[PDB]
Each structure stands twice: as C-alpha cells, then as structure tokens.
Design an enzyme around this catalytic site. Structure first.
Site, short mmCIF file in Angstrom:
data_model
loop_
_atom_site.label_atom_id
_atom_site.label_comp_id
_atom_site.label_asym_id
_atom_site.label_seq_id
_atom_site.Cartn_x
_atom_site.Cartn_y
_atom_site.Cartn_z
CD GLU A 144 14.40 30.25 70.04
OE1 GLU A 144 15.01 29.25 69.54
OE2 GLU A 144 14.40 31.41 69.51
CG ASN A 169 23.68 26.10 70.04
OD1 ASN A 169 23.63 26.27 71.27
ND2 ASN A 169 22.78 26.61 69.21
CG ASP A 188 28.86 26.81 69.17
OD1 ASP A 188 27.86 26.21 69.65
OD2 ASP A 188 29.00 28.06 69.14
CB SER A 202 27.38 27.89 73.26
OG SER A 202 26.42 28.00 72.19
CG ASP A 246 20.38 27.83 72.22
OD1 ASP A 246 21.58 28.20 72.25
OD2 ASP A 246 19.74 27.64 71.16
CG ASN A 289 24.12 30.58 72.30
OD1 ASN A 289 25.31 30.43 72.65
ND2 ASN A 289 23.48 29.72 71.50
#
Length: 129
Positions: free
Chosen positions: A35, A46, A48, A50, A52, A59
RNA sequence: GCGGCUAAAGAGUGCAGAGUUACUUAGUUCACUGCAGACGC
C-alpha cells in the site's frame, strides 16, 4: 517515517493489530508494504480528487478530512494529516474501524490483490515481537 | 585505569537478562543494565 519490516510488525501488534478479527499480523505487515511501502508519509491522489493518506492509504472520501474533497464524509473523525505521522495510532484505529464494518478485510484492496491466499508468515519471519 | 580477541561460520553473537523503534538484511547477534576472562605497551 519509513518503518522497517519488523519495526512495524512490532508496532502493529503493540496496538492490537495482531490477529485482530482473526487475521494474523502477516496480513497487515504485507498490507502496509504493498500500500505505502512502510512509508507513513505516502499519498496518492485518485482520479476523483480524493487522496489516500498514510501507511495503509486511507481515503479522504469517507474516512478523513483534507479540506479539498467536497462531499467527503470523515467517518474516522480526524484530519487526513494524522494518517501521515510517525505514530501509527490514528492510522490503526481507522484501519480497524474500516475492517470492523462491511466487506471486512476485503475492504483492504492491496491486501486483497496480493496477500489474500499467500503464506503471510514470510512477512513476520525473523521478527522479534 | 585507555585497544583488538572471547563462533568454525556470519553483516552482526564473551555470558546473563532487557525492550527507550534507535540501529538493522531485524537481531540466540542490536539502544539499556548487570558482571567479565586471556591478552598488547
């Protein structure tokens, strides 16, 4: 901070991530590697808008507040900046609450892509816990 | 009272514990604490 493999495994257990919800620590050590590469500062945006955060890449759409995601939820009750700290407290509590929930551990993508159905013991091999 | 050695091998172990995540490829080998022996001038 970029945890070593074991230095992490040790910190994870020590919070209550060892065999929590019947999932041995070899699944969380691996989850953090694929990760975030053990790096507690890691971030990926991402498509969209947002982002991480942290060692497990949690998220901001549902789980934390970054200010720059309109229609975000913040279900973990914290600034996404807590997910970046050297102290993994506030990235475990939240990693906990994500798992204790819906898909369960299938809610962990990285885990579900690579480590689900593998001997997740190799990931603890050699580690003083 | 100031250095190397005390494991053939090994990056790492003189014995006994410790666990401040420091260091590290995690470690019977490493932060800390007990005690060290044969050496060198």
């Amino acid at each position: 901070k970029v945890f070593g493999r074991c230095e992490l495994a040790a910190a994870m257990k020590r919070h209550g991530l060892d065999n929590y919800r019947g999932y041995s620590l070899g699944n969380w050590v691996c989850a953090a590697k694929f990760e975030s590469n053990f790096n507690t500062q890691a971030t990926n945006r991402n498509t969209d808008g947002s982002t991480d955060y942290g060692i497990l890449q949690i998220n901001s759409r549902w789980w934390c507040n970054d200010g720059r995601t309109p229609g975000s939820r913040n279900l973990c009750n914290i600034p996404c900046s807590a997910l970046l700290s050297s102290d993994i407290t506030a990235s475990v509590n939240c990693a906990k609450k994500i798992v204790s929930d819906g898909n369960g551990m299938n809610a962990w993508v990285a885990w579900r892509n690579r480590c689900k159905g593998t001997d997740v013991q190799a990931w603890i091999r050699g580690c003083r816990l």
